[PDB]
Write a protein that binds this ligand. Structure first.
Ligand SMILES: Nc1nc2c(ncn2[C@@H]2O[C@H](COP(=O)(O)OP(=O)(O)O)[C@@H](O)[C@H]2O)c(=O)[nH]1
Ligand SMILES: Nc1nc2c(ncn2[C@@H]2O[C@H](COP(=O)(O)OP(=O)(O)O)[C@@H](O)[C@H]2O)c(=O)[nH]1
Ligand SMILES: [Mg+2]
Ligand SMILES: [Mg+2]
Lengths: 202, 215
């Protein structure tokens, strides 16, 4: 018996929280592999479902998105992807169409999740209403906070259900995660769950 | 004290045009059909549908008509004190889907804002007429849509699980075992159903806003 494993490419502008988000899964950070010529650290994030164990091999840049775009060798053969932006910085959100264009060019029809990071910060600029355009392009969306572990499992559980072809798949146990570095205010979480229902109802 | 401690129970009214499959749908729960009670003043059968959740047992008292919706509207006593509802139509007959707004408006006049599920029945029939493209304009205030097939038991538990989450105020509530159901009288194609479920989700997002200024 082999191992069920998928290549996942994590992309988005420099400074949005890609490396802080991938590093919450403790054992994946411990067993990571650095490949200098591709400009990547591949993290093996194992998750335990009701039908057995699965492995997401998450590709995280080495910081070469700050002064340029990514090569075709980073994208080739990916089976799924995450695009990230910061919700306190509008320029990171406006570059989302161009990250999506690269994924489509090299990989065609793969399941992709869009993530808005840094929702623990009070003065938010990009809100639920501005994500409607991306949902019409077939991206799935979640509000995330990498520092407090808010909604960490959501992107990986939606991607596992799509790939396997089972809408009733569940995780039976959570992976060991880095302890929260900030508190996710509970009044802000309830308001943002309300914003998303109002924007996407009907 | 199990008998002293009451029962959690809700009145559910089941409404929609004559011939849409309401009686057939409510009869799939076998113990509900065996224990039903007749009310002669209003002409209704009340079926006690028991479901077992992760926090314990609950009971939906379903009020099914005796066919007086075929000749006209229903009296005020049928609707009074309902806590939730189901509105049904037939996907091979377009006049039943066009009367959906009139059934909704009767509900809100007597009962105001109770939680409602809209069901499109008879998705086992090959030549389907009302599809997902036409259905995604009706889901608005306090309402949810599910495709359904009463003869094959397709999606039977979905309307009842969405309503229990809304009535109790618990979005993580689950059913821990299924009720005994009448054995299927026709097969629902598994590849057809998944296609139909994906069609509703993509029709959802194509109807949506994209108009600046929304609060
Ligand atoms: N408060 C807060 N700061 C965050 C969060 N995610 C990232 N940051 C900050 O954003 C900066 C860049 O993070 P980094 O992981 O290097 O992002 P990357 O360049 O996309 O890989 C750092 O100062 C982080 O501490 C978040 O969830 N909350
Ligand atoms: N094939 C099929 N026929 C159905 C289904 N539901 C209802 N019918 C048929 O539709 C007709 C009306 O059913 P009935 O339960 O009397 O509906 P009511 O008047 O709304 O209470 C009958 O001939 C049923 O057998 C279904 O899921 N599949
Ligand atoms: Mg980085
Ligand atoms: Mg009937």
């Amino acid at each position: 018996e082999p191992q069920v494993q998928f290549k996942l490419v994590l992309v988005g502008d420099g400074g949005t929280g890609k490396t802080t988000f991938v590093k919450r899964h403790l054992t994946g950070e411990f067993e990571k592999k650095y490949v200098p010529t591709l400009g990547v650290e591949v993290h093996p994030l194992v998750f335990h479902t009701n039908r057995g164990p699965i492995k997401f091999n998450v590709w995280d840049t080495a910081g070469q998105e700050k002064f340029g775009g990514l090569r075709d060798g980073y994208y080739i053969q990916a089976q799924c992807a995450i695009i990230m932006f910061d919700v306190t910085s509008r320029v990171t959100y406006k570059n989302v169409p161009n990250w999506h264009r690269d994924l489509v060019r090299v990989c065609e029809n793969i399941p992709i999740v869009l993530c808005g990071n840094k929702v623990d910060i009070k003065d938010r600029k990009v809100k639920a209403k501005s994500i409607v355009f991306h949902r019409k392009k077939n991206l799935q969306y979640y509000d995330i906070s990498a520092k407090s572990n808010y909604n960490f499992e959501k992107p990986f559980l939606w991607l596992a259900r799509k790939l396997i072809g089972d809408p009733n798949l569940e995780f039976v146990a959570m992976p060991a995660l880095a302890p929260p570095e900030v508190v996710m205010d509970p009044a802000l979480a309830a308001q943002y769950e309300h914003d998303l229902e109002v924007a996407q109802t009907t």
